[PDB]
RNA sequence: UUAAGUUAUUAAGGGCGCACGGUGGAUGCCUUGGCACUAGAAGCCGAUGAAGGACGUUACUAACGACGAUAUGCUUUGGGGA
RNA sequence: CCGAUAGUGAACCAGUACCGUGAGGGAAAGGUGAAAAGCACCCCGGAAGGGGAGUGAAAUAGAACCUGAAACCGUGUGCUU
RNA sequence: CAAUGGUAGGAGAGCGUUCUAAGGGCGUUGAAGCAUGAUCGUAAGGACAUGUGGAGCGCUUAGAAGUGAGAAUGCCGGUGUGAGUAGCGAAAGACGGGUGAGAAUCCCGUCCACCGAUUGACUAAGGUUUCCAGAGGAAGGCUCGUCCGCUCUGGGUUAGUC
RNA sequence: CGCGAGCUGGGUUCAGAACGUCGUGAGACAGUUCGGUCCCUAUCCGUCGUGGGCGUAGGAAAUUUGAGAGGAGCUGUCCUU
RNA sequence: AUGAUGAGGUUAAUAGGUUCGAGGUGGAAGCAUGGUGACAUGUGGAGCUGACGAAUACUAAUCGAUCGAAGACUUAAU
């Protein structure tokens, strides 16, 4: 059966992805805890 | 279709009673005289 | 007087090579490796190794020569269990546990 | 008779090729209950040469299978041609028997009784 | 000898004690790291390109520090001592 | 105040294994010895192991390495059935 | 001389664990833990001896508390029982030769069988080194394994026109 | 109202729908109507078969009595008298 | 089901094969004749025939191993 996420490279790092996450104030906060919590993949 | 309880160390034991392997038939090789299983070929030899 | 010799880690869970051991208990060394090598079970190749080694270890250490020796007594013990997981279904894992066994031989000379 | 745990057309079809090889090789190691079906099918074959008449030749085309042996100095010739000329001659004068079979130890991966079943 | 009567033995295995092994990681002891504070500094970093990263850099080579193409470091002034 | 199920989630390459599409969630894991002196050689074995000899105060301190409980698994047997 | 069953519950006296203050002590001529024992007190519990153990720990008085577990379909970690039971995940294998400590299971060969609008050839998406040649066999392969999409070593992707 | 870890699942008692009735309404009625996922590898006792051990004062091969126990146990028509 | 039960292990018919037969099927192959051919006829109730009946050691039950008594007291008759 169809299972969930197909993946596909472009939109992975369409909807995610460092410039997505730095086009909205909100993406800008993710980045922002994600830094402070220590975390190696930042988007 | 599920234990109702455990089974004691004592029935455990008292099952496997029968549950055993037996020695071999082995019998003295005439050619070599070391052991084979009866009624087939000596491995060691190659005899009968 | 007592030669020794021990198998450890071996990859076979210890109720299956007791069943062979419970042959070999105190009967003398010849009859003993007819058994074995003749016995057609798993654990049986690796017991006849470490029946070998204590005879030769009797032979090489204490000049006990194998033509009197008897298998004084011989048994096999847990070892430290290596855990996995089996795929069930409706996203269940069951496990399985590869055991191990400790197996240990020590033949004498009757004597003192 | 024995099933062999087998169905029937791929039961005839080893047992035909069983006794093929064996004719080819003259000794093979198998387990007993194959041998034990084998040597009907491979006694009633040499019964089958030890006639030749065209008729015997025809029928036992059925059962064995197509193959060459490479004879000493590149000689060449087929399972017919040797089971009606180089083992008719050997068994014109035995009135059975044809073949033996030596029980052997149990193999390794499984607890079978290998054998080997020859020509005698 | 025969009648009548009575009673061992057995242990395939089990139980209880005891001895000796294994498995396992409690307990005891220990500290590298934490927790709560006190006293005094300090309480701005960025277009002079920040904070955080990515790639690299060694004689050989993955990781961690350090470093940046002058890369497992360069200069200088002082401290020191194989 | 805590001594490794505690004390940070993190005494140990931890916001890491890992899980989730993503926000996010989020572990488990310290201790040989004083010194590495980390077991020259020999013996069985293809090897893993082992058994001597040697190192060491100690090697049931041999690297999964301090102490090593209980559950659990064995091998003997004195008394029973 | 009288009293002494007891649940919700009230009252009193106490036993134990860690730490602190002071005093007095014990310790490689072997501490704490651990194990055994046929010992002592009315109880919570306290000693003694013998083994393992290889450095800390008792006693008196008094202070403080993360102070006492058998149950919460409690949490974490180990190990059982069910049991040598169920399962071994659609299918055709047989045999000769070789390799090895070991072979139904690896290599070669013959025969046989299955697909064949596909289990065949390409190419996308996706996965990233699984690709190739030597070597190995702990682990992973639902068995075995000398084999491999596993492990070790060294290699491999070449565009003016795709 | 024996028996679903032996079976079915038509009725009834989930979610869909529809008619009559009641309710302004959401909805309702033991009023109808069409449709609607029946899981479980048997530990113990029990029961049907089938082995091994031991005891029956020696070790054996065969034939046995029967203390008990179980199974059967039904009945029609015609003719004759 | 396995184990048991039963028929046998060479001084042997237990099973296989060989030979003969029962039962089953129904006119094998190759020839010759006839037909343009599709075919037909004679050989020849032929050929084939798993379990069913009998004979025959031709092949395998070759070699060997293990277990298994020495008989208690007491009393009464003998
Ligand atoms: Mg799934």
Known sequence: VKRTYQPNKRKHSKVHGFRKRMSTKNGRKVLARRRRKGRKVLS | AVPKRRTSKTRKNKRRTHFKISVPGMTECPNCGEYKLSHRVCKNCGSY | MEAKAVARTIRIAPRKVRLVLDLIRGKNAAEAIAILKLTNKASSPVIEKVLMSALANAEHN???????????????????????????????????????????????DGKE | ???????????????????????????????????????SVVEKLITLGKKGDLASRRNAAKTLRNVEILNEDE??????????????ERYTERQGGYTRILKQGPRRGDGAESVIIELV
């Not at chain 3, 020796?69 to 855990?83: D, F, M, Q, S």
């Not at chain 4, 005839?12 to 007993?32: V, W």
């Open chain 4, 1 to 39: 008779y024995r099933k062999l745990g087998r169905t029937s057309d791929q039961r005839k079809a080893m047992l035909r090729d069983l006794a093929t090889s064996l004719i080819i090789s003259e000794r093979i190691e198998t387990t007993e209950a194959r041998a034990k079906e084998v040597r």
């Open chain 4, 75 to 88: 000689t060449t010739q087929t399972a017919l041609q040797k089971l009606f000329g180089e083992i008719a």
């Open chain 3, 62 to 108: 204490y000049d006990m020569n194998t033509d009197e020796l008897v298998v004084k007594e011989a048994y096999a013990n847990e070892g430290p269990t290596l855990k996995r997981f089996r795929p069930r279904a409706q996203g269940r894992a069951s496990a399985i546990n590869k055991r191990t066994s400790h197996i240990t031989i020590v033949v004498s």
